[PDB]
Ligand SMILES: N[C@H](CO)C(=O)OC[C@@H](N)C(=O)OC[C@H](NC(=O)c1cccc(O)c1O)C(=O)O
């Protein structure tokens with residue numbers, strides 16, 4: 001119940017010329033970091049997928065599919081376009097008990113291989129933040145992973161708060 005403080009938004013770059021149409025589709029979480037994320041070598045974090053779908057109103061339908069307790073859970077929420085392109089807020093925030101704020105900032109992406117996305121939420125008055133290294137495939141170059149590690153560290157996170165989920169085939173394919 002001690003959190004590393006969220007960084008100031010100045011330390012989180014924004015992906016320039018964000019193309020919402022090109023960001024659509026399935027992304028694999030090849031890297032995950034955050035002040036509430038901890039490496040667990042006893043029971044390692046399994047890889048999951050997050051699928052982005054533009055609706056007519058240009059807001060995203062965001063579905064995360066995860067393999068947990070031998071079934072696939074489906075975490076659904078809406079990302080509403082924020083102050084500038086590549087920046088979002090959470091739609092229908094009142095339906096999530098405790099949530100007072102939620103921010104999404106796409107830091108960098110080339111749209112067809114990889115992406116880094118910054119998340120910040122204030123839940124039960126506690127300020128959580130996270131970065132995900134998204135991949136179009138389950139594997140990415142060690143270079144991109146090291147860059148993700150360097151970015152996470154630049155935001156105050158030590159490497160025991162930086163995990164690389166293990167590739168799986170259940171649920172996240174198809
Ligand atoms: N189900 C998967 C793990 O199998 C999962 O929820 O991990 C993703 C991660 N973002 C997360 O939700 O874990 C920590 C959790 N959430 C965050 O730290 C978090 C932080 C910033 C933005 C978010 O949407 C978050 O969910 C928490 O508050 O304890």
Ligand SMILES: [Fe+3]
Pocket residue numbers: none
């Ligand atoms: Fe979450």
